[PDB]
Each structure stands twice: as structure tokens, then as C-alpha cells.
Write a protein that binds this DNA or RNA. Structure first.
Ligand code: MG
Ligand code: MG
Ligand code: MG
Ligand code: MG
Ligand code: MG
Ligand code: MG
Ligand code: MG
Ligand code: MG
Ligand code: MG
Ligand code: MG
Ligand code: MG
Ligand code: MG
Ligand code: MG
Ligand code: MG
Ligand code: MG
Ligand code: MG
Ligand code: MG
Ligand code: MG
Ligand code: MG
Ligand code: MG
Ligand code: MG
Ligand code: MG
Ligand code: MG
Ligand code: MG
Ligand code: MG
Ligand code: MG
Ligand code: MG
Ligand code: MG
Ligand code: MG
Ligand code: MG
Lengths: 158, 319, 182, 120, 102, 76
RNA sequence: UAGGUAGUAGGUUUAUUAAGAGUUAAACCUAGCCAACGAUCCAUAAUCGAUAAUGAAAGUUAGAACGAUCACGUUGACUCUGAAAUAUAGUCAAUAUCUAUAAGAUACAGCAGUGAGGAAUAUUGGACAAUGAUCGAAAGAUUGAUCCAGUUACUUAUUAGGAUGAUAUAUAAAUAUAUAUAUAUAAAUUGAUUAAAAAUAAAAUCCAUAAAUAAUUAAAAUAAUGAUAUUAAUUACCAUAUAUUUUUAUAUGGAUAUAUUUUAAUAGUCCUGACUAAUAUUUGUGCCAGCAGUCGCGGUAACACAAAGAGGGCG
């Protein structure tokens, strides 16, 4: 009970939620540019510098983030029935209907997940802009010179 | 240093003396008899002033100190009586000037030892009917009615609901003569609420005291900075008390400015049913990570704080 | 629920939540709790005795200790200086037993639908009460603001009414009345 | 049902008073063990109804909390629901009649009123 | 509610009872040869008539099958093995080999 | 004071004290030993539970019966 | 427990598994690493939480119950199969029992039970009706998983009655409303003769009740199948009904020379010198018998030892 406060006074544990999209999508050019941004090579350096030999049998540069495309993922995973068939049989009818429904749900899920991530990044940026404006506004509001300050002694030339 | 002590009356009373062996009486019992007076064949104590009930809208509460253990008076002429050596009642030799004039606060105070407790005022049926008509027929807002009569918004809405029940009982003649007699008796037993009387009027500016405010905080500013309620509220990260009270005024169920549209954001799917079915599933949208019975949740069933609830039928259940 | 054992005793002199004649005399002859010449523990014990004898005498102290809430409640008046005059001190500590008045039995007692909390509990158990139109048989039911509760008129009449004498007793009183009239 | 990923119910509550939890769990795991995901709750006991409101025409209701989007995703990626979960999901509308069986054929039975969505 | 008509395979209650199987013959007296009773009695009435738990459940299941035109017959109850269940088969087979086949 | 030298089942030998008015403990008697020391006796560190094992409860004990293994007299 | 480590510390090779490194196997070179902020050794021990206890809190404790993570299924090693076993499989050894005396069978830490060790810990129940698993195309079959019930106050939570109540008998007829009803004669348990009580406590009266009864034929589950099972309320007759969250009023139907039938809750256990709530007083014993967590009681004289009467907690 003592530790439930850190998590909201709620007892027990849920399973960790897992991501619909396991890797960053290609349309997130923001994070693509972030990863391709120049890599620090100094006091806070992230990798090897010029003139230093990385250990034999090791890759000097870190691997490449596998950016995925939603359209490519859908194409590889779920494919339309390119060959149409005469579904006269009962089992054929049932299984075709099931496949249709499953494909629709999966494609909808992937599309909505990508949309959600994009909206999330945009909303985060908008919130950051609002907070920066609020910071500047509050700082200048406190910086405004109020007459009541004259009743505080000041050794300015001192 | 403590000891057991029988709760003898603080006021003087005739104690026991030489009692015939087969009487086995106690000073407590003799004090009881002196307080109650003689018991008539009807099983009544007409002598005791508190035996009956008032009919002049003046509460009749005990005044031990004021009366100094003299609860016996004449039933009809309402004159004081006191026990005599010979054992029969008689008016006191000297009048008690404490009882001749009592303050209104002590008149309403029920228990001598507690000055804070005070009886509440009974609303007249005329006032109840007027408030009913003004809230339903005239459409006047609950805030307006509360401001008009001095009553609190919960009380006025409560009386609206109660008078609705009373009207239904009247339509169906459920009220009876015995209930009417109780009505009259307990109406005459309590004082009436007078809206014209300011000291009678309730206060309409009471707000709950929050935890953040309960704590004491002290701020050091130069001897010329103005500092007001808005600044204090900002420092405490709270909204002004005026905003808090204005919200309270509008919170009323039937009061103005009520809004509870939040739930309108969620999705509900009432499933279909066919002939012969006994129930209907009502699915509702949920959010992963915030739904479902949790794993490893504390089992309080064997502890002193196990939760208990009541279902719609009123049945006791373990929640 | 504690069995009713020596509730109306004159010697012990504890004021109960009832309209009984003996309780009335106890309340009459008690001149307040005597805290003179007592240590802190003794003062606390006497206060506990009296306050528990009145409030919730029918709750095992083990249960009352759980029901007890250390947080008291108060309401602040915003027009205190505006009205003018002298300002009185808020009796916070009188809310110590305020957690018990949200129960159904105490609600009936305060509403004067029963002569005592015990009779209110019996009424609830026997099933002569309803809360918001639901027959509630559990005295420990806790109400919420805006709730409505009703009691049967016959039971309320019995609680706030005189006793019905037996036939022979009534005949005795009527014989006496005959003698007086003649 | 077949497959190593299944959508089923795990019991909770007390003796003589159950409440199930719709979850995605490996077929290999225990019934009440921690699943991959918890989709919703389900109270088999219908909401009680008073005699007057029966003659009014009110029907008992069974609460089934559920997250439609993630149920869609899990039934799209190949999870096989257990028969009871299938009845719940189909009756809601997440699944269709393609999951029905000859043993349960209610299409021919008269319908009182169809499903409907509401923004409560 | 609905009472299906008899057929040539099952002209009457005795035919149904014999055909369902699982030693249901002794229920002759309980059902008294009343087709309407057979298709109108539920587990409550069967319990007060004294049939066993398995017997009543089986009878109701086959009654539902017939009412829905599904096949009526006696289905396998399920035996362990000649050499015994898995948890004892190794020992029993060793003993059997030694004592009969040497 | 009446005391006894007793060997527990665990193997350790200790000295216990027999409370009450009179006792029937003898050589090679099966008894139950609990904690608690007789203050006025140096060395003793345990008590024997009256009413358990072969040690009978105190005779004609009507006050604090449970502490001495005495059964309530019905008298009814 | 003051020096430990020789694949030990690096570098090197080539085998080896999908993949790494002294990780195995080789070579192969350097001397190197860990150490008084505690190495190496030796004991003890299954870890943890959004779990339980405690505290104002930092913390301390537990690791039974609800869930995660390890390691085992008599003990030790090794091998198939596999994507993953040193598998509760095989193979050969250790014990300890059986019957087929044989490349024998079995190790209950799965359920229920039996001995034994303990202060101490249940039923050799019922059903696959529900949720899951395994086989099957299905029909269905198997589940000591699981769901129920049985023992056990081990722990919680509910009810386990409540108004009134200090006594009985006897007094002039020889309806427009009385009312402080008085005299009397008796009776009166245990203490006690007054602030010394037990005690409104008993009986008594008035109302209630889950009390054999009397229909639900609810819900757990529906296409069906209910172990639990003698499962919840309103009535002393049921229900459509004029009453829409509202004992419900209409002598509606068979039986009646207005009710004849209700039945009903009975606490134990500690303590009263102070810490520590308990003043109403007595009897016995007389450094003995005996109390006691601490200070301490008991020498005829005990507020402490055994009582009796009162009394204080918890229930
Ligand atoms: Mg004291
Ligand atoms: Mg299959
Ligand atoms: Mg059950
Ligand atoms: Mg000592
Ligand atoms: Mg005892
Ligand atoms: Mg090594
Ligand atoms: Mg290598
Ligand atoms: Mg080597
Ligand atoms: Mg060390
Ligand atoms: Mg160990
Ligand atoms: Mg720990
Ligand atoms: Mg555990
Ligand atoms: Mg530990
Ligand atoms: Mg266990
Ligand atoms: Mg192993
Ligand atoms: Mg073993
Ligand atoms: Mg092993
Ligand atoms: Mg093996
Ligand atoms: Mg076992
Ligand atoms: Mg033993
Ligand atoms: Mg135990
Ligand atoms: Mg079985
Ligand atoms: Mg309890
Ligand atoms: Mg006497
Ligand atoms: Mg059924
Ligand atoms: Mg003692
Ligand atoms: Mg000393
Ligand atoms: Mg003592
Ligand atoms: Mg004593
Ligand atoms: Mg006594």
C-alpha cells in the first residue's frame, strides 16, 4: 500500500502495453532528420573520433534505424486475393468473409496508429510553443518595474 | 487521583435517613421520585414541567442550573411548586429571579453543558408552498429563491422534493388524522423561520475549507506592495473564494448553469436481442492500460478495512 | 452489536440517545464532566466513557476505531468582516463523532422517526424504512447528500406516541374515572 | 479454439459471485495468469429489474467494458477468441455471422430491435 | 413447448429410451410411456423423479437433439485401455508381458 | 516454591515453575512448557501450562480459571 | 578468513554454436588481475511488487495469502528428439520398497487420504453446470485444472429486541368536559441505616421476527445442458386491475354452526496498590499458602495472596 502512491493509489499491476508499430515509420521525417543530425564528437561525444582505431572485429558506426513504411508493411503482410474464385462452397464463403474482415481490421489499425503518432508529435510541438510563450510572458511580467520597488534600499553605484 | 463516584445530583435534595429494613431504597431513586413528582393513577406525572409539550412555538428545554432542581410546577396555573417538610407541594418561599427572564440563545439551547448546539427553525407550510410555486410554476431559479428567503440552496431544493411527495400523498388521501395531529404538535413545538428576520436568516456565503488553505503560509514583501485575495489565491495556486462560491451557487441540480456533458465523449453499443432472450449486453468503449481488474490487487477481505457496498436492490455486497 | 446492558442506570449516569424517562433524569442531574484533579489519561478516559455512552453505544470499539476519521470538517464564512461585530470561535473538535450521522439509524433518530438509535436499527432491520424508494434492511447503510429516506407512519406513531394499555389496566383507569365523575 | 494467441476470459471476484476479464493470453499459460493485454471486464450477472419496470418493458442489461480498436487489432493479427468471447464480440458487432455455427442459429428467430450506437 | 411427432425408428418413449443408450432402460416407470412428459419435463422434474445427474443431463441433451432433428444414438463413454491408463501403463504392461507372455 | 526440571522435545533441559494451589507433577511426566520467569528465583525461566498434558488444573479454582486450567462449574 | 588467482589477467591464433568473450578445445605470447570502500574463503538464505504489518516519516519486518522471477519433482552424471531439455523422457549408477526374479516395476513436493516429526495446519466429498486446456471434420470424449460443497471462530464483516416498567387490595347513582384523586390495610430478596448500593435490573404490559408454513419456479447459460441446491422477497390465498420510485385500497374464486393458527432470540473472559479505567464494604491465611510485565505484596494488622458483595475493560 505504501508504494501505491507513486502510481496513483491503485493496487496491482497491468501487463505492459505493447506498440502496434514496433519501429518508427518512414513518414516521421522529424525523427529521421533527428537521427541523421550531426553526431557529437567532443566532451559529450557519442562515438569514435578522427584518428582512433575501433577494436578489431567491431563495427565502428552504430547500426541503421529500420524505418518502416505503413504501405509497404500492409502490402507485405496482408495481400488482396489477386486470383478471384467462385465461392460456391459454404466453407469457402465463411473463410473468405473472415479473411475480408481480418484484413480490414488490420489495415485500419495500422493506419490509425500512424495517424495517432503524427498527431502526438504535432501536439507536443504545439504545447512546447505555448509553454515557451508562457515562460517569456511571465518573465517579462515579473520584469515590469513596479513603483513599490522604491521602498527597497539600493546600493547601485556601490 | 480518581475514584468511582455515583452520579448524585449536584443540586440539593432530600436524602435517605432511617429507612424501614424492608424498603431497600436508594438516594438515586428518591431523587428520581422528587424530580418526577407523584405518579397518578393514569401513569402520568403532571407536576413535572417537562412532562408535556409546549404549544406556543417556544422550545421547553431543561434548565437545571437556572431552576436548581425544581422541575415541579402546577399543571394549569404554571406556578412553581416545591416539597415541604410535611411532604406535600407548596410554592417556594422566595421567587427565583433567574427563571423570570431567559435569553433567547439559552431558550433554544437544548443541553445545558453544550452552548454550541441549537435547535433549527421549522419552515411554515405557507413558505413551503410559496417556494414550491416559485420554483416550478414561476420558474424562479434556486439561487433567486435562496437569496429571497435566506435559505440554503440544498434546503430549498429539498423542500421542493418533499412538498412534491406531500402533494402526491394529498392526491391519494394517504395522510390521516393521527399524522395531522403529529404535524400540528411538532409544528407548535418549534419556532418558525422568518425571512424578514436577519438573525433568523441563514448564511449563504459558507464554502468548504480546503487542505491547501488550512496550512499557514507567510510572505515577506516590502512595506508598500498591495496584497489582496487575488494575490493570496495565486500564491496558493487556488481560484479566488468568490469564484469558488459562485460555482457553488451554480452547482445546484436544478440551479442555473449546470453542465455534465463530459460523459458525452464515450461510445456505447447496445447489442441486439431476439425473441426468447432474457438480457441485453451493453458494450462500451474502453482504454487499454486503464481497464480490467488488476493483477496482484490487495486482498482486504480478511482485514479490518474490507469494503462493503449496496446494490440497486439495497442488498449488502462485498465490493 | 453490543447487547443492551444497564443503559439507563442512575448510578453510572450516562446520557444515552433515547427519550426514556431515566435517561432524562440522568441528563438532568449530570452537571457536566468533572475533569478536576485528573491526569491526562484519566481525563481522556472519562471523556471517552461519556462521549461513547451517548454516541454509538452499540458499536464495538474495534469497529468504531476503524470508522473514526482523523480529519474534521468546517465551513468558512466569507462575509465575516463585512457583517461586522464580534467573531466567534469555530468548535472544530465537536465534529469528532460526525462520521456517525451519515448512517441510516442516526438519520432516523435525528429526524425523530424513532425514540432511540436502537429502535431505529430495529425498524430498519424489520423493514419499515426505504431510502430513495429501496427497502433497506441494513442499519449501517451510509447516506449521501440529496438522499431521501422514509419510515412507516405506524412505526413513527408508535415511536412518538404514548403506550397502548392492556384491557384490564384500561378498565382500572376507567373505574377510577367513573368514581371521580360521580 | 486453436492457435498460440487466444482471446479468452479470466475469472475474478469471489465464490458464488464471478466477474470475468477479457484478455489476450497465450494458450500455454494459466487461466488467471498475467496476459499479454487486458481488453475489458464482463459481469455475467444481469442488472436486477423491478416488477413494475418489467411490465413497463425494461430488459435486464449485462455490462461488457471493452476496447474496440485493440480488439480489432488482435482479431486481425490472428488471435482466436474462445466461444464465449466470440458470442460477446459478434453480438456487439465486432465480429460477424461468419463466426457462427450450425449449433447456434438465431438468424431465423425473430428480432425485437437491432443494435445501435450512442454517444452517452 | 413444441412437442415433435414420433418416427418409425422411435415410435414411442420405450423406443427413445432404448435407442439413447447408457443404461437408461430402468427409467421406464419414471416416464410411464408419456411422450408429452418426455418433451415437457426439465431437470427440476427429473430430479424430483429421482434420476441421476448424468442420466438427466444425457436425456435432456438427446431430447434437444431429436427436437432439433439432430441424430439420436448412443455415443462412446470412453475407456482407459486394456493395459491401463498412461500413468500405470508401463508397470501394467511389464507385469502382463511377464505373467502371460513370459 | 515448587519447580521442576524438564527436558523439552528439542533436547534442551530447563527449569520450569508450577503455579497454583497444589500440583500433581511427578517423575517422568509429560507437560507443556511456556515462557515466563519466576522473578524471585534465580535460574528458573519458564512455566508449565496447568490443564495440559498430565498436569491437572488447580482444584476448586473459581477466579482466573483460564490462567489455571479450570473448567466452569455448570451448577445448572 | 590477509593475502588470494595460474585460464588466473591480456594479447594472439584455428576449431566450435545463428551469434561473444579463456565459454568449451587446442595452440599461443605478455605478465597480469582481485584485495582493509574487505579479495579469497566459511556459514546462513529461494528473490520481488502497484502484496501484508507497522510508523508522522525516512525506514524496519514478512515473502503465508494475490501476482511476477528463479531452481527442483527420490540423489548424481550423460545422451537422443528440438528452434529451445542435462526433460517428472531415456542410460548407468546411489538408496528404499514391491512381484513378474526380469535390458523388471515404483519413488504422491498433482488431488484425497496414512504413519512419523511437531504447540500446531482440513474431505480417501460433488460436477465438468461456468472459464480454460487436450483429441476430433464433427458428433462428442478426458480433465483432483477449475467451479462448488465438508472440517477449522485462523482473519474480517453482518445481525444475535426494544418501547414501558419500582408493589398489591378497599372507598355514597339508595349528559351542556371532570382532573394535583385522597385516605387507608398489608407486602417488601442480598447488603446497609444514608450520599451504600445491587436496581429499570427483574418480572409484567405493547409492538415487532429470516420461527414447520407459502409461491419464486429469479440469477449464475443459453441453441441446450445447474454440482452448488431443501439457493431472495410479499402475503397468512394468489394476479391482470382502476395507483407509474407507489404495505397499497375494489369482502371479484373455493371453503367459514369476522378472524379462528402463529412462533421467536438469554455471553464469555481478564482485571480493581501505582504505572493503568475500577471507594460499598466483609471473610479466610498470617514471610506460610500463594501472586507478579516493573516497582513490589503476605510476620493475626492484606485495597496486591484465595473468596463474597460492588465495580472497570474487551466481547
Ligand atoms: Mg486509578
Ligand atoms: Mg481442433
Ligand atoms: Mg456459485
Ligand atoms: Mg525483578
Ligand atoms: Mg476464566
Ligand atoms: Mg574462467
Ligand atoms: Mg575465442
Ligand atoms: Mg590452452
Ligand atoms: Mg568478507
Ligand atoms: Mg535452504
Ligand atoms: Mg524487503
Ligand atoms: Mg506467495
Ligand atoms: Mg529477506
Ligand atoms: Mg499454498
Ligand atoms: Mg531438472
Ligand atoms: Mg517424496
Ligand atoms: Mg535431479
Ligand atoms: Mg530422469
Ligand atoms: Mg498430498
Ligand atoms: Mg505427536
Ligand atoms: Mg490453525
Ligand atoms: Mg472427480
Ligand atoms: Mg467479528
Ligand atoms: Mg437484610
Ligand atoms: Mg435451467
Ligand atoms: Mg491472579
Ligand atoms: Mg528497590
Ligand atoms: Mg495488581
Ligand atoms: Mg484478590
Ligand atoms: Mg464477585
Amino acid at each position: 500500500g505504501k508504494g501505491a502512491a507513486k502510481y496513483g493509489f491503485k493496487s496491482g499491476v497491468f501487463p505492459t502495453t505493447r506498440s502496434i508499430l514496433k519501429s518508427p515509420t518512414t513518414k516521421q521525417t522529424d525523427i529521421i532528420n533527428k537521427v541523421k543530425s550531426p553526431k557529437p564528437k567532443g566532451v559529450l561525444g557519442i562515438g569514435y573520433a578522427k584518428g582512433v582505431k575501433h577494436p578489431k572485429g567491431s563495427h565502428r558506426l552504430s547500426p541503421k534505424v529500420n524505418f518502416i513504411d505503413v504501405d509497404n508493411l500492409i502490402a507485405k503482410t496482408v495481400a488482396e486475393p489477386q486470383s478471384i474464385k467462385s465461392s460456391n462452397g459454404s466453407a469457402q464463403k465463411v473463410r473468405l468473409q473472415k479473411a475480408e474482415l481480418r484484413r480490414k481490421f488490420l489495415i485500419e489499425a495500422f493506419r490509425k496508429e500512424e495517424a495517432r503518432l503524427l498527431h502526438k508529435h504535432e501536439y507536443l510541438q504545439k504545447r512546447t510553443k505555448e509553454l515557451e510563450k508562457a515562460k517569456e510572458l511571465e518573465l517579462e511580467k515579473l520584469n515590469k518595474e513596479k513603483s513599490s520597488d522604491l521602498t527597497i534600499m539600493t546600493l547601485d553605484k556601490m | 487521583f480518581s475514584r468511582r463516584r455515583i452520579a448524585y445530583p449536584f443540586y440539593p435534595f432530600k436524602k435517605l435517613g432511617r429507612q424501614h429494613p424492608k424498603k431497600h431504597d436508594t438516594n438515586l431513586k428518591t431523587a428520581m421520585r422528587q424530580f418526577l413528582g407523584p405518579k397518578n393513577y393514569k401513569g402520568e406525572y403532571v407536576m413535572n414541567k417537562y412532562f408535556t409539550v409546549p404549544t406556543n412555538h417556544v422550545p421547553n428545554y431543561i434548565k437545571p442550573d437556572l431552576e436548581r432542581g425544581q422541575s415541579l410546577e402546577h399543571p394549569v396555573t404554571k406556578k412553581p411548586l416545591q416539597l415541604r417538610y410535611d411532604g406535600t407541594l407548596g410554592p417556594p418561599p422566595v421567587e427565583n429571579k433567574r427563571l423570570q427572564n431567559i435569553f433567547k440563545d439559552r431558550l433554544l439551547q437544548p443541553f445545558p453543558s453544550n452552548p454550541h448546539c441549537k435547535t433549527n427553525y421549522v419552515l411554515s407550510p405557507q413558505l413551503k408552498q410559496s417556494i414550491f410555486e416559485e420554483i416550478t410554476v414561476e420558474g424562479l431559479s434556486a439561487q433567486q429563491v435562496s437569496q429571497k428567503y435566506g435559505l440554503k440552496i440544498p434546503r430549498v431544493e429539498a423542500i421542493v422534493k418533499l412538498v412534491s411527495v406531500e402533494n402526491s400523498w394529498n392526491r391519494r388521501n394517504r395522510v390521516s388524522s393521527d399524522l395531522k395531529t403529529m404535524d400540528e404538535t411538532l409544528y407548535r413545538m418549534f419556532p418558525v423561520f422568518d425571512s424578514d428576520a436577519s438573525f433568523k436568516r441563514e448564511n449563504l456565503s459558507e464554502i468548504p475549507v480546503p487542505q491547501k488553505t488550512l496550512a499557514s503560509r507567510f510572505l515577506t514583501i516590502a512595506e508598500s506592495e498591495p496584497f489582496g485575495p487575488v494575490d493570496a489565491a495565486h500564491v496558493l495556486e487556488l481560484e479566488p473564494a468568490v469564484e469558488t462560491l459562485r460555482n457553488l451557487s451554480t452547482v445546484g441540480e436544478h440551479s442555473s448553469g449546470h453542465q455534465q456533458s463530459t460523459n458525452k465523449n464515450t461510445k456505447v453499443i447496445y447489442g441486439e436481442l431476439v425473441e426468447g432472450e432474457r438480457s441485453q449486453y451493453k458494450f462500451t468503449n474502453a482504454k487499454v492500460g486503464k481497464v480490467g481488474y488488476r493483477y496482484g490487487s490487495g486482498n482486504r477481505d480478511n482485514k479490518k478495512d474490507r469494503r462493503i457496498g449496496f446494490n440497486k436492490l439495497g442488498q449488502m455486497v462485498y465490493i | 452489536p453490543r447487547k443492551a446492558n444497564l443503559l439507563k442506570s442512575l448510578a453510572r449516569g450516562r446520557v444515552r440517545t433515547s427519550f426514556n424517562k431515566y435517561n432524562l433524569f440522568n441528563l438532568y442531574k449530570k452537571g457536566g464532566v468533572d475533569l478536576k484533579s485528573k491526569s491526562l489519561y484519566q481525563q481522556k478516559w472519562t471523556a471517552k466513557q461519556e462521549t461513547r455512552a451517548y454516541h454509538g453505544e452499540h458499536l464495538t470499539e474495534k469497529r468504531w476505531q476503524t470508522v473514526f476519521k482523523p480529519k474534521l470538517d468546517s465551513v468558512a464564512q466569507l462575509d465575516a468582516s463585512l457583517r461586522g461585530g464580534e467573531i466567534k470561535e469555530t468548535p472544530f473538535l465537536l465534529q469528532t463523532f460526525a462520521v456517525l450521522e451519515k448512517r441510516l439509524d442516526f438519520a432516523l433518530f435525528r429526524a425523530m422517526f424513532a425514540s432511540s438509535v436502537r429502535q431505529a436499527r430495529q425498524f430498519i432491520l424489520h423493514g419499515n424504512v426505504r431510502v430513495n424508494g429501496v427497502k433497506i434492511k441494513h442499519p449501517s447503510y451510509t447516506l449521501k447528500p440529496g438522499d431521501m429516506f422514509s419510515v412507516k407512519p405506524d412505526k413513527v406513531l408508535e415511536a412518538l406516541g404514548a403506550k397502548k394499555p392492556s384491557f384490564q389496566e384500561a378498565l382500572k383507569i376507567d373505574k377510577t374515572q367513573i368514581v371521580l365523575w360521580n | 479454439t486453436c492457435g498460440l494467441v487466444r482471446i479468452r476470459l479470466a475469472r475474478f471476484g469471489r465464490k458464488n459471485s464471478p466477474v470475468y476479464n477479457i484478455v489476450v493470453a497465450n494458450s500455454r499459460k494459466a487461466r488467471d495468469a498475467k496476459p499479454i493485454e487486458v481488453l475489458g471486464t464482463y459481469v455475467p450477472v444481469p442488472s436486477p429489474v423491478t416488477k413494475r419496470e418489467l411490465k413497463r418493458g425494461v430488459v435486464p442489461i449485462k455490462d461488457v467494458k471493452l476496447d474496440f480498436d485493440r480488439t480489432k487489432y488482435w482479431i486481425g493479427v490472428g488471435a482466436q477468441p474462445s466461444e464465449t468471447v466470440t458470442k460477446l464480440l459478434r453480438k456487439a458487432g465486432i465480429l460477424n455471422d461468419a463466426w457462427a455455427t450450425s449449433k447456434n442459429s438465431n438468424v431465423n428467430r425473430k428480432v425485437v430491435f437491432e443494435r445501435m450506437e450512442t454517444l452517452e | 413447448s413444441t412437442i415433435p411427432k414420433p418416427s418409425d425408428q422411435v415410435p414411442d418413449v420405450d423406443a427413445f429410451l432404448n435407442k439413447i443408450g447408457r443404461n437408461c432402460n430402468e427409467l421406464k416407470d419414471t416416464f410411464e410411456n408419456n411422450w408429452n412428459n418426455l418433451f415437457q419435463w426439465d431437470s427440476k422434474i427429473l430430479k424430483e423423479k429421482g434420476v441421476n445427474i448424468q442420466q438427466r443431463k444425457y436425456i435432456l441433451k438427446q431430447v434437444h437433439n431429436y427436437r432439433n432433428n439432430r441424430p439420436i444414438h448412443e455415443i462412446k463413454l470412453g475407456k482407459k485401455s486394456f493395459f491401463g491408463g498412461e500413468r500405470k501403463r508401463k508397470a501394467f504392461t511389464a507385469k502382463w508381458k511377464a505373467e502371460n507372455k513370459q | 516454591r515448587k519447580a521442576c526440571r524438564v527436558r523439552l522435545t528439542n533436547g534442551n533441559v530447563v527449569s520450569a515453575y508450577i503455579p497454583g494451589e497444589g500440583h500433581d507433577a511427578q517423575e517422568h511426566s509429560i507437560v507443556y512448557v511456556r515462557g515466563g520467569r519466576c522473578q524471585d528465583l534465580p535460574g528458573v525461566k519458564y512455566h508449565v501450562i496447568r490443564g495440559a498434558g498430565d498436569l491437572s488444573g488447580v482444584v476448586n479454582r473459581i477466579s482466573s480459571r483460564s490462567k489455571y486450567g479450570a473448567k466452569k462449574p455448570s451448577k445448572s
